[PDB]
Symmetry: C3
Subunit: 333 residues, 3 copies
């Protein structure tokens, strides 16, 4: 009887940060309450000032990471304010039935709905909007995020021993298909409805114009680089709702990787690069051993360095000359 269960309200945070949670469950099963408000908004996605009409959960691309434990119930209040123009819904890949919830959560502007589902399988999972006839358009306008369903006893390695992370970040990777004219310049529009046939044509090329982390070129750089210290254990959750990616930590590794995101499987060890298929969330665990700047990229390096799928970590601490050293610094022959 669900009404006998504790309820807990979560207040979400903006990616790449993740709301507070406990790895090992400190309570029995609960109903975990979340609220998200849909926001259609203009977003500038590159250095050149290219502007799109983004479709967001809670104002960000990606939407926020939700965290529960296996056999909790997720109860989502989804709000579509009357300042929006389009119908939206939500499909959770974590959920069972009704198109992931999509068939039950169609909200017009000015409506809201509350969906409950049981989180029966542990892992990281994509969620995304999916309105009938308009699915890729909403997804590729930014309307996707992820949910993490932790095992009740937290994460385990390939030998069943505990893995505990000190920090967690969520990297949402977004492929955009900004329409171009014949000469190759992007079109700008007053409303989201002003793209539709042009959006379909752009999408049908299967060639993104931009591929970004956290909604824009350079979003995870500068004052907004990810941070860690030497010795810290970091979990990086990465999602791609529509298109394959291949993450890589330049200067590091994925010590334990669940490339397709599902924690009942043993992790793959010592990965250089891993493939997260489109429509999937994955997770990588790494312990930093060297200080300095790292680049976290999609290792199609054109996608990384020309299209935008690159971020930075800035790591503090002690350099280890045993692991790497410059024996003879660059100099003339």
């Amino acid at each position: 009887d669900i009404s006998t269960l504790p309820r807990v309200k979560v207040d979400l945070v903006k990616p790449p940060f993740v709301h507070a949670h406990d790895q090992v469950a400190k309570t029995g099963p609960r109903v975990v309450e979340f609220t998200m408000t849909i926001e259609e908004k203009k977003l500038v996605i590159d250095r050149e000032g290219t502007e799109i009409h983004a479709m967001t959960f809670n104002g960000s691309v990606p939407g926020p990471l939700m965290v529960v434990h296996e056999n909790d119930y997720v109860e989502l209040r989804l709000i579509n304010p009357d300042t929006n123009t389009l119908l939206h819904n939500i499909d959770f890949h974590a959920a069972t039935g009704a198109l992931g919830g999509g068939a039950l959560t169609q909200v017009n502007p000015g409506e809201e709905t509350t969906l409950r589902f049981k989180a029966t399988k542990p892992g990281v999972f994509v969620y995304h909007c999916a309105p009938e006839g308009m699915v890729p358009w909403h997804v590729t306008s930014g309307m996707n995020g992820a949910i993490m369903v932790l095992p009740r006893d937290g994460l385990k390695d390939e030998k069943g021993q505990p893995l505990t992370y000190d920090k967690i970040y969520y990297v949402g990777e977004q492929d955009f298909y900004v329409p171009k004219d014949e000469a190759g310049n992007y079109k700008k529009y007053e409303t989201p409805g002003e793209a539709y046939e042009d959006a379909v044509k752009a999408m049908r090329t299967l060639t993104p114009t931009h591929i970004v982390f956290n909604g824009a070129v350079g979003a995870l750089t500068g004052d907004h680089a990810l941070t860690a210290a030497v010795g810290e254990r970091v979990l990086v959750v990465h999602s791609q709702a529509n298109r394959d990616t291949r993450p890589h930590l330049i200067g590091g590794h994925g010590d334990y990787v669940w490339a397709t995101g599902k924690f009942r499987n043993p992790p793959d060890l010592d990965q250089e690069t891993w493939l997260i298929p489109g429509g999937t969330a994955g997770a990588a665990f790494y312990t930093f051993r060297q200080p300095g700047v790292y680049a976290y990229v999609n290792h199609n390096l054109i996608e990384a360095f020309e299209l935008g799928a690159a971020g930075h970590f800035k790591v503090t601490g002690e350099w280890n000359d045993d692991l790497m050293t410059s024996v003879v610094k660059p100099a003339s022959m």
Copy 2:
């Protein structure tokens, strides 16, 4: 001595259905006899009436699923009637030697041949036509299917416990490259030979014009949706002879997945989406828990919903409100 073995004749069925077989072998090793007749034919592949010259095994795209057990012998009588125009052959990825059989099965119109091979490795495997100099053209005209080599003791989970399916379906996914003129309209042709240089150019774009299940947009919908009941265990075999795909059951999961199709490996558990590389067959096992319509898609959602790689399941039975429920149906604020 092969002549001392039983012979059994199989009569194939059209995809997505699968001919009758036993999961656990009820006999010793056998010579399993199959006959396929090659048919070049016009196929309408979309709602707009786009017509191609398809190259088929047994009249369908994909070709039919063949089912044997490990250490059976497969004996295929391959017929190329004189009503066809092209030379064809067959390469079985299940087989060892002679380019999968391709070097031994070149048949001109008006010829036939009989190939035998031993099915030494368990799994699902692609088969496809592969004539020297014309390989991608034949494959991407539809001339591919799959073969399942079951372990003699049937399928097993990650703990070595039995997995028994109640129903099986075969989803062949086909990338087509229909040539376009400068303005973007498809060209139509009187004969298969009328494409060749234009076909090569279309293929070299690496951008399919259509990606379909069972040979056409919408083929696995309506009266031709896949069916199941709540509680039934379903195996879905999926193949892609040329290009990566990432299947996903919208509203469900792959409870046990062999993404690259080979049954001596433990399955991956609880998959949302999985990557089947081009040139591979994979298999997913799911037990339905909720009734209703499900969409089975390639989760590049542009490929699914714009290019055609989407089908439906229609599931009968009892809705489970514990797993999912609408707490507050969509309504005005």
Copy 3:
């Protein structure tokens, strides 16, 4: 104290061959010394005579395979002669810190440097050039290779039993983006610097013009086919620094495959085809059972047979009619 360790000098060989090494380590940890000289050079990459300005480690595309054991130190002397025009560096995916070494190995023409790192994780790994602001351009001009870090006790199967290879080959797969004019003809250039904005535009299409093994169409054919004998155990290391590939041995299998290349994981068994993500090296072990010609391909068959990603094995020995035979050779009905 590293100065107390033995030093051993390796003399590299041209791909697809691999320098001499021992699978099971016959010594304790060592400092393994390598020297590579960067060469910018014109390369003809296809049958039509298309010429690019390649950027190479040691004169070849790919760069040579380096082989060490886990917990050895790699000490690389990297030389950029004054006959080159560009700055270069090196990032080892095997290494920890400083962008894989890239931050420590920037060499102008006329400079050299010596980097040391500890090979702490076993596997095959990509290495590539990565100069700030010019990363994909250098990589997709050929400036990448791989390093194998063997476990000290050699390779093991999924049951922890030894796997010993008789022969090893290294297949580097390269995506090139040769700029085209409006009509579709390739542009030719006097210097590497003559591409830059045109190179970026070509890359941004995400559509390679050529995908080759060992630096050219047909490089691993004819007198340069790979060779083996029936009964021989062969390890094929395959790398792709920028773009996914899906290798397949036509007529064979990957008996044991580490698709993402990391030897602390059990291999996948009986693969038909496997996905090596861009930015990764993988390895496949096969025992030949049939003589004849095999084709080793990327199983996007357009990429193989139209764009160049195909090579051959020529295998000597005894045909096994139990595994495959032509029962009735092609003939008229």
